[PDB]
Design a protein around this nucleic acid. Structure first.
Lengths: 93, 56, 136, 108, 261
DNA sequence: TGCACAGGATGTATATATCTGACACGTGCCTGGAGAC
DNA sequence: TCTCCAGGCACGTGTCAGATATATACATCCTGTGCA
């Protein structure tokens, strides 16, 4: 058993470009890319949560981490997409 | 034991390859009636001896 | 109004004469091979054959290699098959068509050597009756 | 009683529970909140969508139907914020941009 | 069991002379069983069950292996077709490192296609053959064919041609086939051109070509009669003849076949 | 001594036939994500 | 922490793009010969 983000990446390019094939090398490039952003964001959030004497990682910690790591334009697009997704998820009433 | 396992693996590979080579070289009605749907409908039957009228 | 089937037959005079000779060829109960030059010529004949609901099979260049075995086997075993759609150089190179005699060359005029190979395919030893080579 | 995952609850196509699993046994904090994997899932989904959009028109600019890391490399380094993000990373089989300094041309 | 036995003995006689033969006769009389009897009697002569190559179109390849299995099942047959994994399996099996004659090995007869020979010239340049037989040689009519080039480059040193009609008359085809028979003597085509025209072309191929015909056996085959039907165009088949030249080959050919095309 | 004309040869031009060739889709399974406390 | 079922993996089978090939006739270009 080994884990890959291949199907999710596949449907992501299928919403935007249906008639587009993919290379396996390009898939490995993309997998390494998303894993690198994941570990960077996770270590930034864990370091910030340790810095504020708090034992809980919440949405505002990765919010500050995304403000910190990403450059500003892609930062406010990222937090905008995250806020609409989180507010849509939180409406379980 | 290693030589016997190697001979068994060689025999299995030879058998698989011979089966593949033998399969590649030697191997590579009345129409049905229309459906009859009569639901929620009356019926008239005329047999030789007796007639029917199935109504609702 | 739909494209009429009889209007599709009658607007082509070669197909018109073909439909006339098929009436007596099926009335006698014979075995018929028909040759063509193009894919689109044999992409139109089976529509005419569905009007007659004739037993017909087609062999061409895009057919898979294993199907050419069992189609020839069904030819040399089943006698109820009627129409044999053949390409120029596919069925005319060494194929055993010994129980067939009536070949219909629709447009076999591209080179005489291919036609020579074509009528060497059916006119072979083991044929029990006379061979009539039609050329429309 | 049966209900689907949290990803389409948030309207996302990336796995939310897998992100939660990687956060929990990734050993970053002893307590992980509820809304954090959804936020991270949305961020990584948006970044992947933007990267594949750029690779998409980079591959339409070469008249092809498949993605070569030439197209990925080009779509990275003709965009300035991905240039700033991915400055220190090297891509496998990427090459360089066509550039030449002004005085090196045959000016005459 | 026919007069092909004396023909195959004459082929073995010119083999004993040391030159490659020409079959210049039509298909129908059984050249396939004649060639398998050539191989069987040649094997009876100098004890060779070894390398034999059959180059054959893919539709009649199955007919070839079928008649080989039905008539003379003593040898071991090998096909060469299919996918790449089956190609690698047959590359594992056809291994013939031991040179000259072999007995307990499955490479007795080797059947393959024209394209497959053309596209595995990197692998068929090795495995030096003993007897290639190319049936239906009309596809080696052209001297510019790359298949003809990789058929030149083998190390078999036997180039027996099997075809129904070698007489396609493009005036380069005869030089090409003769240059395939002996590579060594025939290489200059200009001297073939420069060295009464109808009479002097008949005895050039006379020691090589044999003269047979279908009108020598009992004829229950049918004695085929050509019934030709000539018919006239319809109006819809008439007006596109003027339409095509109004805007100004195979185009009008197919409009003649059926307008819908 | 040059130029023009004629003849021959070569190249082109666009469906076939084959015919691989590397791509995209129809079934198992098992385990880990989801619900409940 | 207990339960439990379908997601996504893994592994099979089919379908439009490239490559040699026939092919005949037409057109263009080059070379040779004859003439002024």
């Amino acid at each position: 058993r080994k884990e890959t983000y291949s199907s999710y990446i596949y449907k992501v390019l299928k919403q935007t470009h249906p008639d587009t094939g993919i290379s396996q090398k390009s898939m490995s490039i993309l997998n390494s890319f998303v894993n690198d952003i994941f570990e960077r964001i996770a270590t930034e959030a864990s370091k910030l949560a340790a810095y504020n004497k708090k034992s809980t990682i919440s949405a505002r910690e990765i919010q500050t981490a995304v403000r910190l790591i990403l450059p500003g334009e892609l930062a406010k697009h990222a937090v905008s997409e995250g806020t609409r997704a989180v507010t849509k998820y939180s409406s379980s009433t | 034991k290693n030589l016997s396992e190697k001979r068994l693996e060689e025999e299995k590979q030879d058998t698989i390859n011979k089966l593949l080579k033998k399969r590649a070289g030697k191997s590579r009605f009345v129409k049905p009636r229309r459906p009859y749907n009569s639901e929620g409908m009356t019926r008239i039957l005329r047999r030789y001896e007796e007639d029917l009228f199935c109504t609702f | 109004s739909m494209p009429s089937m009889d209007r599709f037959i009658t607007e082509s005079a070669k197909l018109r004469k073909l439909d006339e000779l098929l009436v007596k060829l099926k009335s006698e109960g014979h075995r018929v091979l028909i040759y063509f030059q193009m894919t689109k010529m044999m992409d139109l004949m089976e529509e005419y054959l569905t009007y007659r609901q004739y037993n017909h099979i087609r062999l061409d260049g895009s057919s898979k290699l294993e199907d050419r075995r069992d189609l020839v086997h069904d030819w040399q075993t089943n006698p109820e098959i009627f129409v044999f759609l053949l390409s120029t150089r596919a069925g005319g190179l060494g194929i055993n068509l010994t129980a067939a005699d009536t070949v219909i060359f629709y447009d076999s005029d591209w080179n005489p050597t291919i036609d020579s190979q074509a009528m060497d395919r059916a006119h072979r030893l083991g044929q029990t009756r006379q061979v009539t080579v039609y050329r429309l | 009683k049966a209900s689907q995952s949290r990803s389409a609850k948030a309207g996302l196509t990336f796995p939310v529970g897998r992100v939660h699993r990687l956060l929990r046994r990734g050993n970053y904090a002893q307590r992980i909140g509820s809304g954090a994997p959804v936020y991270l899932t949305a961020v990584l989904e948006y970044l992947a969508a933007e990267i594949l959009e750029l690779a998409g028109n980079a591959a339409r600019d070469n008249k092809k139907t498949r993605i070569i890391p030439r197209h990925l490399q080009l779509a990275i380094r003709n965009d300035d914020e991905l240039n700033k993000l991915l400055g220190n990373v090297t891509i496998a089989q990427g090459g360089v941009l066509p550039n030449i300094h002004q005085n090196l041309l045959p000016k005459k | 069991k026919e007069y092909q036995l004396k023909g195959l003995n004459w082929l073995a006689n010119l083999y004993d002379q040391g030159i490659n033969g020409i079959l210049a006769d039509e298909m129908g009389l059984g050249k396939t069983v004649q060639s398998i009897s050539v191989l069987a009697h040649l094997a009876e002569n100098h004890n060779i069950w070894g390398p034999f190559l059959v180059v054959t179109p893919a539709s009649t390849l199955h007919n070839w292996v079928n008649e080989i299995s039905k008539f003379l099942p003593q040898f071991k047959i090998l096909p060469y077709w299919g996918n790449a994994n089956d190609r690698k399996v047959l590359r594992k099996f056809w291994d013939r490192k031991n040179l000259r004659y072999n007995k307990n090995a499955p490479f007795h007869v080797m059947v393959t296609s024209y394209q497959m020979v053309v596209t595995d010239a990197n692998y068929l340049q090795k495995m030096k053959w003993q007897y290639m037989i190319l049936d239906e040689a009309q596809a080696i009519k052209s001297s510019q064919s790359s298949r003809w080039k990789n058929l030149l480059s083998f190390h078999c040193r036997n180039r027996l041609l099997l075809t129904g009609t070698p007489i396609q008359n493009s005036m380069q085809e005869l030089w090409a086939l003769l240059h395939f028979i002996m590579p060594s003597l025939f290489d200059s085509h200009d001297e073939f051109n420069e060295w009464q025209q109808l009479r002097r072309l008949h005895m050039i191929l006379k020691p090589f070509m044999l003269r047979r015909v279908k009108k020598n056996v009992q004829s229950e085959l049918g004695d085929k009669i050509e019934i030709d039907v000539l018919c006239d165009l319809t109006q819809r088949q008439a007006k596109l003849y003027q339409v095509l030249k109004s805007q100004i080959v195979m185009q009008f050919r197919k409009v003649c076949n059926h307008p819908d095309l």
